[PDB]
Amino acid sequence: TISRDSCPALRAGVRLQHDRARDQWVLLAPERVVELDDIALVVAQRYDGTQSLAQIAQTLAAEFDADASEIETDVIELTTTLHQKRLLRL
Amino acid sequence: TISRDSCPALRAGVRLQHDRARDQWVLLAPERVVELDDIALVVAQRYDGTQSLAQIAQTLAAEFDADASEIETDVIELTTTLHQKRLLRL
Known part of the structure; x- marks a missing residue:
């Protein structure tokens, strides 16, 4: 966490x-790249701000003849990572 | 937090x-803008990956004839926000 002992530097x-023009100072953050592999590629495409992760996992597990419990864990893990990276709207 | 009930959408x-070329799929996140006002502008400029927030606050409070306890709180609050936005290296 951040405390008085933190010694930050702005990232590259x-x-x-x-x-x-807007009479304000800002920090401009650069574009970012996040790698998606295998099922994560499909999950990212399936997000639609309507379907839940449970529904997405059930659908994908059925489509790929995979175990739903396993896929749900993977879907939640991926979404957590993407959420941490500020890439999602919930 | 993220759970099976989350219904995410990729942000704009x-x-x-x-x-x-790299045989991979990725998500490209757009550049971001974070507003900095008054003392936050100075703090952001003072980060150097060496000085601690305590040191930054002590320096600024002395320079601006302000109360150090108050400034330390403000410095920590700002840094926490910038850290959440993935803008810092600790």
Whole structure:
């Protein structure tokens, strides 16, 4: 966590900018790349802000003749990672 | 938190891309803008991956003839927010 003992540095590509037109200063964060492999590729495509992870897992497990409990764990794990990376709307 | 009941959607600008050259699929996250105002502007400039938040607060409070306890709270609050946004290296 962040405490008084933290010694931060801005990450690479994160730069300070004076947005004169809007009379404000901002930090510009660079575009990011997140690798998706195998089933994660399908899950990312299946997100639609409606279906739940449970539904997504049930659908995929049935489509791939895979175990639903296992797929649900994988779907939740992936979503947690993508959520941590600020890539999702819940 | 993320559970089986979550119904995610990819955020705007987050798109799926087939990086054929690297034989992988990825999610491309768009550049982001984070507003910094008043003392937060100075704090962001003071980060150097060496000085601690305690040191940064002590320095700034002395420079601005402000109360150090108050400034330390503000510095920690800001850093926590920037850390949550994945903008810092600790």
